[PDB]
Design a protein around this ligand. Sequence first.
Ligand SMILES: CCCCCCCCCC(=O)O
Ligand SMILES: CCCCCCCCCC(=O)O
Lengths: 259, 258
Amino acid sequence: PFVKKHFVLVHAAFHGAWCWYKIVALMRSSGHNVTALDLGASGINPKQALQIPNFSDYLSPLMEFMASLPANEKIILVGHALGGLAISKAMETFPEKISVAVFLSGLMPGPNIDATTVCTKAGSAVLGQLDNCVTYENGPTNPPTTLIAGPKFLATNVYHLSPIEDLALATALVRPLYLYLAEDISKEVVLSSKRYGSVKRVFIVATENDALKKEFLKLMIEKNPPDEVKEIEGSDHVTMMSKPQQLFTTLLSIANKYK
Amino acid sequence: FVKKHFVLVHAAFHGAWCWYKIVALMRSSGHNVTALDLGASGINPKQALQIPNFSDYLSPLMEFMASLPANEKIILVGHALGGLAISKAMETFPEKISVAVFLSGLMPGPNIDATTVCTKAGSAVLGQLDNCVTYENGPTNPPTTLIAGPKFLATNVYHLSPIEDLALATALVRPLYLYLAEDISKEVVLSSKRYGSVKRVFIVATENDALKKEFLKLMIEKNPPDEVKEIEGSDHVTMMSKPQQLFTTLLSIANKYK
Ligand SMILES: CCCCCCCCCC(=O)O
Ligand SMILES: CCCCCCCCCC(=O)O
């Protein structure tokens, strides 16, 4: 009783559609439709970070994709980490086009724990970490403009349990992230219980995530309870790299449950 | 154990990312490796329409080569179209290169022009399957860029590679500006005293394509390298289909021409 589904994958900071390559392959081989998107200035998106200081422009690729979805079509929307904010806005805007939303170690703000709160905590876990650095394209009087992930940070905090070739891949592809302002994010991502909250939600925890500590993740799960919490043991931050098969099986299960 | 420095240059539509398996093997083995993105390739910031001159496309490699102190020799590896890039680097900084390696690369020489090799190579890409061209300069002008299609990648390029690598490529390949023959001919000028002074190895890595192999054989005949090596079971992207084999071959070459 095969039922073709449409998975939409949204990456985390510094990454792009490319990070989902193992999952995309498994999905396509299964006969499912899968769309891996590059958010603004990510992957091979043409914009450069400094060219998109407005958060709406970082999210535009997903919003535009959602708006173009055929009528009556439902998707399984998956967001990894920072990608959680993107799918959250998609849920609030197009709740009817989403069968179920999946937050993979994702920022999952809610009415009782808004985006600014989540982003501030998220920032503290990345800014200043190991060899990560910021730039000041607008001068020292202004806030730092972009954040650049360093190879040591990637090796230790993100890809510690992934094949070494995936770390090499990431080092050749990660791009800078514009340090979006708190006020800008708070105005772009506003969630309501009747829209955002009406979409089925599942959170997937990576048990060995050294990028985002469990306390923070548990905080979001507690202050904004999802319909279900799944766990993938032995996974580092990039579950799609370290535990691809398990993630795939888990996504299929989720898709069949909320179809 | 002597530490070596490998510099890897990709083919059309690709970028530094395509060498990820090789980069990992080299780094874990203790060697230094630099995989470069040519213009408008991988995460290079330029877009194809911004680099209409072949010199613009080669810029990343030439800037890198210029930054190398003469005593820091490298093993320069070029894949397919990347052969033209390393050829230019060989003519400009011949002494900084211990040995140049052409992996199924376009290897023009005095007896076989760069435009000649480009036209031939392009025949197997232009108009193939779902590949397409754009006309950013209007319909009354030659096409401006070439875009590799998914079916073309699956059937002609990644046909012997893991399916996940095909997925990776589909999410990363970028358009190639259709450089003019006149431009290429002016940019890639080689001399026996400079280009010809660099040790050169050609790696034949093709399968199921007699014509492609005939083309590689033609270049080897018209521009004889110092040595020719083979890698079997490889599709267009040897670094994806036969990584361990390519890695060991590059190390063998490096240890020989040191
Ligand atoms: C809006 C800027 C906030 C900083 C980004 C911190 C999130 C790191 C998580 C990730 O996406 O892998
Ligand atoms: C740069 C001049 C345009 C050449 C035509 C395209 C050939 C691509 C060859 C390759 O890497 O397989």
